[PDB]
Design goal:
monomer, mainly alpha, Multidrug resistance protein D, binds the ligand Nc1ncnc2c1ncn2[C@@H]1O[C@@H]2CO[P@](=O)(S)O[C@@H]3[C@H](O)[C@@H](CO[P@](=O)(S)O[C@H]2[C@H]1O)O[C@H]3n1cnc2c(N)ncnc21, hereditary hemolytic anemia, methotrexate transmembrane transporter activity, folate-binding, transmembrane helix, disease variant
Length: about 400
């Protein structure tokens, strides 16, 4: 029986790999590990010299990985996604200079640019009749794997009282285990662009760019997702500015990346109801949430007292919880009439245009070759950037 051997030995393996590839307990505790006494980096060295290299290499490896993940049929990039993860946690545990953490953020941007490999792999592997049952079970393993990794990272730090250095050796036990799991993945018999079983993409783009909702939510995915990424990369440097007490027990970075995933699974679930119902007022639905993001970025830049670090965590859970609400709606309005050969090209070029904006703002605001702002004055620039973006869509919606 090959059909009963598929759901037992393959679909139970994609939901086991997709669970175990998201297990990185020290992923929420990289920046408290760098700024702690273990590596002993100064804040001025992480916000201006290490973290802007994350948004530079992510421009450099976005298009090389996206072309390679379809040409190699998604398995050696899923092998690379896991192996570059190990190269991050090796440089975190063996590197001591600033140049050994700039290389750490270069391998970390490969693991961000190969996030699409996994999901774009379940589509090319399973049959389209059984695709909704497999990818529904697979994304319920990634979202479970993202949530319970930050819980496992938090309970070892808060409850287990394990140190930050010994946490990354636990994180090297799951990342070396998920490289071996990426070896035994079934390579798909097709792909999306190169390896097909047998251009119109330039012709159907001439018909889909004239849509009002594809024009709107693509200009949201370029600019609002650029400002979203510049908060998540720098909110752990801001929490270490508010409460810089090196204790490895009062830091709840894993409890703010698990509660943001749990809220990111609630508002995502609540966005599927409003997906096609609120498509008319989507130009005002952006400005109601971008302004809410404009206040929560300012709330991060307003809290200075270390006794209110708990109010900061909640200003970031409600930030990711509000960004996750628009994306269910964003992925819909964009991918409504697009073919799969054109949908992965529109999202593949919206992410590149978002990484163009992420490269511009990091070189202007965050990098030492531009202004070189600290992370307290940097979030005041992003709160202006979200409020500038909020009054564009609010004035844009009122024109209707
Ligand atoms: N269909 C796909 N093709 C190619 N790559 C994909 C992909 N669906 C996911 N991913 C990748 O997995 C990552 C984590 O996904 P999640 O943890 S399973 O959920 C994400 C995350 O919570 C947030 C930031 O997402 P993001 O920065 S783009 O990161 C995603 C993305 O890189 O938005 C959610 N999200 C993204 N897309 C959708 C969607 N279509 N419907 C409902 N929720 C969505
Ligand atoms: N974060 C991202 N970066 C780059 N491209 C992205 C992207 N998130 C989405 N897409 C694109 O949007 C297309 C349509 O997505 P949707 O219409 S919004 O929903 C899809 C679709 O119904 C099904 C197969 O379609 P698929 O091959 S994924 O095609 C996706 C994908 O190409 O999987 C659903 N889906 C995708 N991600 C999630 C998720 N995180 N949680 C729940 N459902 C999800």
């Amino acid at each position: 029986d090959p059909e009963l051997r598929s759901w037992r030995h393959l679909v139970c393996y994609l939901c086991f790999y997709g669970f175990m590839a998201q297990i990185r307990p020290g992923e929420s505790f990289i920046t408290p590990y760098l700024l702690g006494p273990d590596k002993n980096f100064t804040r001025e060295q992480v916000t201006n010299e290490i973290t802007p290299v994350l948004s530079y290499s992510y421009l450099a490896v976005l298009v090389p990985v996206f072309l390679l993940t379809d040409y190699l049929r998604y398995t050696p990039v899923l092998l690379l996604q896991g192996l570059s993860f190990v190269s991050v946690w090796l440089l975190l545990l063996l590197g001591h200079s600033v140049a050994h953490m700039q290389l750490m953020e270069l391998f970390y941007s490969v693991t961000m640019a190969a996030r699409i490999a996994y999901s774009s792999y379940i589509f090319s592997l399973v049959r389209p009749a059984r695709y909704q049952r497999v990818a529904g079970y697979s994304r319920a393993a990634v979202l479970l794997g993202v949530f319970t990794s930050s819980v496992l990272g938090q309970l070892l730090v808060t409850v287990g009282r394990v140190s930050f250095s010994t946490l990354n050796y636990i994180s090297l036990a799951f990342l070396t285990f998920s490289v071996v799991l990426a070896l035994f993945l079934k390579r798909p018999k097709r792909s999306l662009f190169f390896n097909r079983d047998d251009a119109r993409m330039l012709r159907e783009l001439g018909d889909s760019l004239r849509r009002p909702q594809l024009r709107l939510w693509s200009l949201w995915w370029v600019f609002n997702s650029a400002g979203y990424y510049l908060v998540v990369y720098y909110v752990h440097i801001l929490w270490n500015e508010v409460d810089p007490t090196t204790n490895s027990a009062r830091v709840y970075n894993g409890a703010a990346d698990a509660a943001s995933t749990l809220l990111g699974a609630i508002t995502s679930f609540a966005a599927g109801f409003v997906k096609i119902r609120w498509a008319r007022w989507s130009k005002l639905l952006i400005a109601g949430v971008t302004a809410t993001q404009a206040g929560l970025v300012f709330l991060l830049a307003h809290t200075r007292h270390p006794s209110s670090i708990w109010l900061c965590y909640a200003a970031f859970v409600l930030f990711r919880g509000s960004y996750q609400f628009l994306v269910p709606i964003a992925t819909f309005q964009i991918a409504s009439s697009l073919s799969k050969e054109l949908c992965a090209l529109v999202f593949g070029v919206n992410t590149f245009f978002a990484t163009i904006v992420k490269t511009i703002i990091t070189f202007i605001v965050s990098d030492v070759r531009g202004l070189g702002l600290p992370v307290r004055k940097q979030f005041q620039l992003y709160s202006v950037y979200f409020l500038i973006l909020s009054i564009i869509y609010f004035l844009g919606a009122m024109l209707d």
